[PDB]
């Protein structure tokens, strides 16, 4: 038998349903989602980190001339100068007044320290959802990890359950993501091979151990000071460190709907948005005939306490009279009130106390109890606390 | 080195089995066939037998098998097997045989002793799979090369293993014999036996090479004597009773696992093409049944697939977008029309 | 993006014994097909070894002289070479097929490493 | 798949029960009223009340490495190409991604190949690979296999060591005086699909897109156009007076 | 790595509002965000004791004040 149901997208709350049959007893269903993940499909483009200015020892020739040989190191700058009078701690490295030539060559390489201290770029698309559910059908408790696409149901005890696609494909992530130190920021990083000096992306390395990088740091060599040996060089500071000083706040504290982002695998938790359609195919074995369930007679309901707070704050006692003693499920067809428990123990002439949540000042509604309808009416009062530490439990009707 | 490969099957013995059809009828045989596998392309098939090969009572080509508990050996070139035509035995190793012979419907395996012929036939399908798209019955002398799957010729430790089990109790009516008034039990030298009887009350006795007689029993048919062995495991055969307790003491590798190799595949004759305005005709003459696959190079292919085993005529239309076809195993041929 | 890095090989005399190691790194959890391929100068690519879980395969000309071992925990494949012949001169590549990304953005199926050159001197 | 039969469990002249091993799609049954036989005559003495127990199961065959079928889901095809570009007699062969970014840089020249004008992909959402051939087939999803058709056995990987089987394995009454386990199940669906074997994509693809699978890919087929954007610096533009007129 | 903890802030409630008094020992960052489709994320640095007043709706309010784990609140009708 096919049964369609709707699930609000919010973990931490229970949800009760009754499956009605004309000739058989109603069947209870209790569902509690424990954790929902919105995992994006992300690919890896490149990695960047601190760079280190490499240089070879200066090439000094005395009364002669030199030539530049290309090593093809990334962003290599090679230059030759003349008119130098070298010095050393022991004395004069030359006897020539002029014609001495110096060759200075410089380049960059990835800093050794950034095996872990590396910033990663990312491009994300086509987020998929994965929910962990606790199901109780026919008082059979099970915990399941289910896929919520248009296929891939789960089978247990013959019950088949399929959760349809999301009602909304919204994703907190933008196209272009940046990952660093377990923090995820939406940033518009430039693409491969088009970096600029001073900004994020002066260095471009495909992988951590690619050993093939493209660098654009605007490195410029300078005339060495007379009377000493060195290679003066100048380049813009690290765009990585400049972006580190900028550091706009995190998606962890700026994303809407209160999503919780985690970075072991990139994922978003408990994004409270939308609803999940679910379809039950229940075998006829679990369905119970009417004669096997107690039937009430002359039952009345009275409200003992009223607080229409966020939590369950309406307590009602039902005085009934039953031929048989057996557990059965109570249900509220309307959205006026939400019952807490899924079933209540039933004895031969006892009274059943039930807890529920409502937002109406003057509640009045009918309880389906296992064979019959019973009216229950009353007026109710506000709470005493202006703020609470848990979300809403019942819908707000017009 | 191969003795380290042979070492696994030094720990086991052959076993008698039931076979539904000896030369006489329903029968107990040493050459009962458990299973047959035929997945290789060139007709290479694997038989799982109840005997052992390559081990003497280490020798190259021999068959080691069982006779009422007594192990015997025969040269390998005496046994034969067939389905529709005489097959050819290549090599044997342990409980497995590799055979190469054409299609059929049943597998018969037989051999001849000095005066008694042993055989039986099992009806398990054997299938011959052609490679490519040229159906044949015997691989050609010449052609081209392709990659199909054939069964490897040599044994090596692969990732496929089987399970042995502790042998059960084997009843032997030969051991029991009638004395003047009692029943005489004579277990074989160096082996233990279990005698269980109900001639009087319940009886159970483990004899260890002891010729013991039991009172209160007059006839011999009332009760049974068994044989006990601890070493020399047996395969998990469905034709034997099991021992007592957990039935597991390791596993053995299975040789002759399939592999990839180079395959000879026939070549069809060249079809003679004749061209006309936006059309082509293929004068065609096949040696064996062969596949035509034809496609158009447009948004929709109108793909046509056809098996022809006789000379025929086909007229095809070609447009500027293009026509493509494969006959046999030739590289695909693409034709592109022109204005004229 | 998953990549394969090869190591080992080198120069050796006839009859020597070498090792080749290929390692997979990236967003991968479990791997199915470990394979090795050799390409001599002036000839097309060919398979030499093929490992997948407990099973191992070998080609016709290479039986009894090469051994392949796979470590799924490290996602590495090691090829032990023994008693090499002058026909073995070629460049060896390591292949990975049937990659299972751990969601794990679905991506390219197979990947290829740079490979290593092996040369034996007569 | 390979049917694995346990050794027939005999307790003649007594009684037995079932011990589930929890192997995939295992079936355990107990039969009474058996008079088994062995080569050395009858096994035991009690005429009736003899209990056989038969356990049968299925395990993946030993030939699963080089003979197996893989099911894949395909979406968001990506295009790239190998170009040979000669501008200002500066000829280079280079790989380029024809997406809307990633220019190729040489001699100061930056070439951007924009996205494809058509999103046509020669693969359906589901595909099946087997022995280097690809077929667009609607395979049932994992865990919903049907006997006698594709997907009777479902293993997460070649060495997952855990499979879900739906083969409809049913035991039968053993023949009198014979130690054996008579079983019945539908033929494997893989060989039936092999018998069917509709023509492959490399022979039925539109636009003639040649399909090779070193990785699953398609090549050499004409659909649409590549927009090209040239970013040329001002240095390579030569004076007309320096050129023949 | 050991990182210092800021003193507990003083909280007072009101009809759809909360007033927070902060008495920091050292400069500290206060961040606040609503749980609606929009954040109105605010990210301030305070180095002097101060008082702030914020308005909260039913959709939920959240803030982090120092290394204390994030705190959340919900407003109901009264």
PDB file of C-alpha atoms in Angstrom, chain E residues 37-65:
ATOM      1  CA  UNK E  37      17.159  33.917   4.906  1.00  0.00           C
ATOM      2  CA  UNK E  38      19.316  37.051   5.433  1.00  0.00           C
ATOM      3  CA  UNK E  39      22.176  37.291   7.982  1.00  0.00           C
ATOM      4  CA  UNK E  40      22.612  40.980   8.785  1.00  0.00           C
ATOM      5  CA  UNK E  41      25.960  39.673  10.032  1.00  0.00           C
ATOM      6  CA  UNK E  42      27.705  42.105  12.379  1.00  0.00           C
ATOM      7  CA  UNK E  43      31.389  41.738  13.267  1.00  0.00           C
ATOM      8  CA  UNK E  44      32.726  44.265  15.794  1.00  0.00           C
ATOM      9  CA  UNK E  45      35.859  44.782  17.899  1.00  0.00           C
ATOM     10  CA  UNK E  46      35.403  46.114  21.439  1.00  0.00           C
ATOM     11  CA  UNK E  47      38.184  47.106  23.847  1.00  0.00           C
ATOM     12  CA  UNK E  48      36.161  49.113  26.419  1.00  0.00           C
ATOM     13  CA  UNK E  49      33.216  47.981  28.592  1.00  0.00           C
ATOM     14  CA  UNK E  50      29.946  48.766  26.859  1.00  0.00           C
ATOM     15  CA  UNK E  51      26.241  48.010  26.480  1.00  0.00           C
ATOM     16  CA  UNK E  52      24.383  46.927  23.334  1.00  0.00           C
ATOM     17  CA  UNK E  53      20.700  46.380  22.546  1.00  0.00           C
ATOM     18  CA  UNK E  54      19.493  44.023  19.809  1.00  0.00           C
ATOM     19  CA  UNK E  55      16.093  42.990  18.454  1.00  0.00           C
ATOM     20  CA  UNK E  56      15.184  39.326  17.922  1.00  0.00           C
ATOM     21  CA  UNK E  57      12.346  37.747  15.933  1.00  0.00           C
ATOM     22  CA  UNK E  58      10.934  34.218  15.961  1.00  0.00           C
ATOM     23  CA  UNK E  59      13.341  33.127  13.204  1.00  0.00           C
ATOM     24  CA  UNK E  60      16.187  32.781  15.735  1.00  0.00           C
ATOM     25  CA  UNK E  61      19.219  34.771  16.883  1.00  0.00           C
ATOM     26  CA  UNK E  62      22.840  33.680  17.335  1.00  0.00           C
ATOM     27  CA  UNK E  63      26.099  35.208  18.506  1.00  0.00           C
ATOM     28  CA  UNK E  64      29.681  34.348  19.415  1.00  0.00           C
ATOM     29  CA  UNK E  65      31.402  36.443  22.105  1.00  0.00           C
TER      30      UNK E  65
END
